[PDB]
Design a protein around this ligand. Sequence first.
Ligand SMILES: *CC(=O)CC[C@H](N)C(=O)O
Ligand SMILES: *CC(=O)CC[C@H](N)C(=O)O
Ligand SMILES: *CC(=O)CC[C@H](N)C(=O)O
Ligand SMILES: *CC(=O)CC[C@H](N)C(=O)O
Lengths: 313, 313, 313, 313
Amino acid sequence: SMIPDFMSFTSHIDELYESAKKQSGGKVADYIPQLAKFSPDLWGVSVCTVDGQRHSTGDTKVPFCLQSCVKPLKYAIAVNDLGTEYVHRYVGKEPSGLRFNKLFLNEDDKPHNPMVNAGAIVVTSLIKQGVNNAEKFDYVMQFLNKMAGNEYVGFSNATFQSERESGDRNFAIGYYLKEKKCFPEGTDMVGILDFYFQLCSIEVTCESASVMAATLANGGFCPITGERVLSPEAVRNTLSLMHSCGMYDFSGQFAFHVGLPAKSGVAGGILLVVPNVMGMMCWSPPLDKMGNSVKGIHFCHDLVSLCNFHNYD
Amino acid sequence: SMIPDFMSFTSHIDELYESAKKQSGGKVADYIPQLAKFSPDLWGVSVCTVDGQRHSTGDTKVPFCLQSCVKPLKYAIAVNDLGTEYVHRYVGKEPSGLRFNKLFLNEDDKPHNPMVNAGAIVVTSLIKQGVNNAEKFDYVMQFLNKMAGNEYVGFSNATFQSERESGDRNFAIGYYLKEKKCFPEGTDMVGILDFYFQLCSIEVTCESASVMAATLANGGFCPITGERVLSPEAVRNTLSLMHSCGMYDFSGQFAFHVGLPAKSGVAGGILLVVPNVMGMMCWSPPLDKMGNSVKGIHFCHDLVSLCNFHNYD
Amino acid sequence: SMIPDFMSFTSHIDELYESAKKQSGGKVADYIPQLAKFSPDLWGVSVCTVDGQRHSTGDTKVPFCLQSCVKPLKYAIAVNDLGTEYVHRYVGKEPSGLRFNKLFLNEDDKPHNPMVNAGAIVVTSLIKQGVNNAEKFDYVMQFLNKMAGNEYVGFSNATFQSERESGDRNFAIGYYLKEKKCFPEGTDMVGILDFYFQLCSIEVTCESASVMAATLANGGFCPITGERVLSPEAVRNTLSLMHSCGMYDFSGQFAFHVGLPAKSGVAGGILLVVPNVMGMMCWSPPLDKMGNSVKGIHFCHDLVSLCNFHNYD
Amino acid sequence: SMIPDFMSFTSHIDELYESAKKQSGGKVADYIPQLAKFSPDLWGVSVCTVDGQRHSTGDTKVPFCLQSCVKPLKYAIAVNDLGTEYVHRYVGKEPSGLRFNKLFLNEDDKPHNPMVNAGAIVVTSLIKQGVNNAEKFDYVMQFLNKMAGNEYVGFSNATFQSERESGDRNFAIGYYLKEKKCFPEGTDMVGILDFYFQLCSIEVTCESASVMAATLANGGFCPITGERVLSPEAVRNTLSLMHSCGMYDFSGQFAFHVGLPAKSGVAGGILLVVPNVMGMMCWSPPLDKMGNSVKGIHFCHDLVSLCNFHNYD
Ligand SMILES: *CC(=O)CC[C@H](N)C(=O)O
Ligand SMILES: *CC(=O)CC[C@H](N)C(=O)O
Ligand SMILES: *CC(=O)CC[C@H](N)C(=O)O
Ligand SMILES: *CC(=O)CC[C@H](N)C(=O)O
């Protein structure tokens, strides 16, 4: 461990939190009213160590939607249940060339990776096939509860309804993937879209999410229950792709400067993993031009430059 | 006129027809059974001069679907009813860079031109807005009857039903254009898709189609009725775009070597215009790798190399 | 002929000239001092009919460099001496997809067409192979004299020297084409670049250039000498490509709205052809964002909208 | 440490070596005779731990050229002498979108990263500016000697001469970067190319190279001399970019499946780093379709799947 005194570490998290707090730039997402509602001043950071030690500061009990933060989690589930090889017959393993989610496939007509919409849509089609959407949803909720050691995991029906109604681009992607035969045989593509919108609409708090991150940090064992949630293979794949593909078009800079597996989402969440050390969830709705939470980005840079957490430190 | 003796010209058309007939390569389209049905050996050529003189050879009374051959016709209708400026607020004026129908927009987020699917879908949304799809369809059928001087214009319901069921790519394009706000306000995109599939499913014969081509060749006046069908502006726009965008990825080579406005379709039709001389429709189901009728392409090359019909001869 | 009274036509040219004159926008090219020198207020239009009738207005005797205006001319020479088939083993036949001169090749690793730099560089390598650069240059000067019926054809040594010194992009293209084996065996690529810079540096006046344009308008016969300068094949190819590829990224709009073969150049020249009617050269140094002379573009639009000269009028 | 018994580890390296040995596919590079000379059956693996423990098997004393293996090393030197911020004013920080070395720049007109040719060419221009090429070369040779703890570092004059004569693509890149102003003011671009060719032509053995790799594995301290060669910042940057950009178009798959910083080269070398554990150099001339040594790739996969060396194991 690189944290001898947890309490002193705590004291530093608070200092970084406080420094990030002064960063007021960015714009709260407003493509649906359920995101536009949110106050720009909301800002929470929660830590859950591999030990099971906890620390929160700021708004760490206000629920918000995982949104793209869910992409690594459902990917992790797919690999856990199906293994690396099956999953990757359907989706690639690396950063899309140009901009994030520009609607195309790789040389093999597979979405580039699970962290872009096309890829997450396909991953969604792989999970618990055969059963109805209601059972699919329950199965995943249950899985996230395990990842979160039974802490806050809810569902925003209003976000779901708005996502489905306004999600023209995701429908375009759905039909495109159908044309290119990207789904396993017998897939109801529209039903898969619905399931996808639902998954984006799952709600968490910084506190519960940090436990999910910590489970990934802990080889797939939930640090506050001790139970095995994910296969080692699942964790490793997920971390690799979070490392390279997790921060939209900022993934490259993030890997270089921060060097940690992370996944941002349009609600302003940033799911952060320090392998063998801790999980974290940082949350603040206002987003930069690349769609990453302004405060969270700032906090991540400061955290690594302070605690020498970079992959290659 | 560049045809002093029509009868002698006739005799030459027959020779070219006969030479093209020996070209057996290519593949009949089979993405729907309504296209796969067709015999590879079907081959017709019909001419209608600006004078109103007629000549057919081969299978010139077997109905087949316009398919993309309809794109210039509905574009012509849009401009006729709405003028160049309005239409082109919605669709561009030039060859898409890369491959034909690769799903993207130009710098202004407009489809590149009316001869690609995205562009024709948008053009379809412009026609007779406000009225229901049934009236839209009738209005256009009536318009084509005028273009064809009341000769064969029918409708393939089976093609329509199959186009809608198998048209995932067109649905992707529909949703993409909706996301990018490419349609006039208050557009039912799905309804527009339906209308689009219907238009592709309109049936003609070489004989009736050649009269449509001749109307374009004749400044928008139907050479066998004498009535004005299209505005001069409409004809000129349509010819310009047929010249540069009408033969899929072969448009460039076709312009260079043949130099005539034309529009191919997946049923194997090639609508050909010799400005101020005649209209023609050539038809043969087997298509080359670029989607153009093998016999028709061969015939077009021979026709120009013989009668010096090239734009810049 | 579409010009019954030449004198009345003359009177109209003057009106259009005068209207264009009020268009003061645009920027004189300044990448070399030899272009930056030029006054923005210079503006000339010269007409030479297929008959041999002449008319000039404004600054039609001030020499300026052909620059890219030379591309169609040397292409025409290559085809004249070597035939279509040989030339096009080396260069394509159609508009490059994206922006003009973005440095790449087509599917067959050939430059897209002769009107872009990569293509003109290759065309230059085809002309009078075997002889030294001095003889190559003389041969071409002589050819242009024939095209111009012995009117002004000079050479700007200062432009040449500056083009070679500042032409890093053309050197990059030279080496790229060498890597991809785009030149005939035994080509001195650097020497070909030199020759290319020289050709760009050939000087003309509106008056002499319009005779060159008129020769193209007249099936390759110089209207003021009556001698055959270019093969019919050469003229037709050149016109086709001028039609589609001649106005940089504005080629598409120009074809649609004007419908005439033309070729612009960075000195502000626009070589215009009205097939079977006349040649023209319009010249005014200030260029729009696409590199086309602002006054010339304006004048071309007005000319067609007035005299119904559009290809498909 | 994850190696308790070095001798037992040794025994396993030998087993993997032996297994890789049976992989006979791939093609020895032949774009210059100096590469084509090499036997396909040559195959060496050398390990140098952070401890300073050593082990070799196979052809680990036959000199070969670093080629692209040098890219991370000179990048490391640039950052060491100039700091991250200066270096990255000139070159980017992340994987190029499409194929490796396809000749273009990022949004800011900088080469995408130091591991592609355009980027390494620019990095080369940054080193020891002001002094002549001879001193530049000596300075770097001296630096590599330090990295290698004074083991084999030579120079292939024949490779240099052939690289310069056949390097048309690199010259194209040189001129392109000059046009786009990618070099620090006052750069002799041609001289920089020369220097670049020289650096590619530096010779090493598996044994000496593994010590260079080990220096990177050891926070920039040479494990067999104990001296500080590189700044911590330099090492971390280099490792990050090796991780994401080091294996040409295979970088994505390599990161996912192997999860180690590596850099391949066309001579068949693969410079491998296991942070805080060891450096390795694997070498075998025959390359796969992506330009990576067939045996080395195979060996790397097996090594991680055996010793759990993956970044996220
Ligand atoms: C990755 C992100 O949060 C965007 C989420 C949104 N629902 C989408 O585009 O699917
Ligand atoms: C242009 C062509 O004939 C393809 C027609 C087909 N229905 C389509 O892709 O819309
Ligand atoms: C086509 C044009 O006038 C640009 C000319 C200039 N010399 C060049 O880029 O070669
Ligand atoms: C990266 C690699 O080894 C190719 C090296 C070669 N000299 C080059 O293209 O510069």
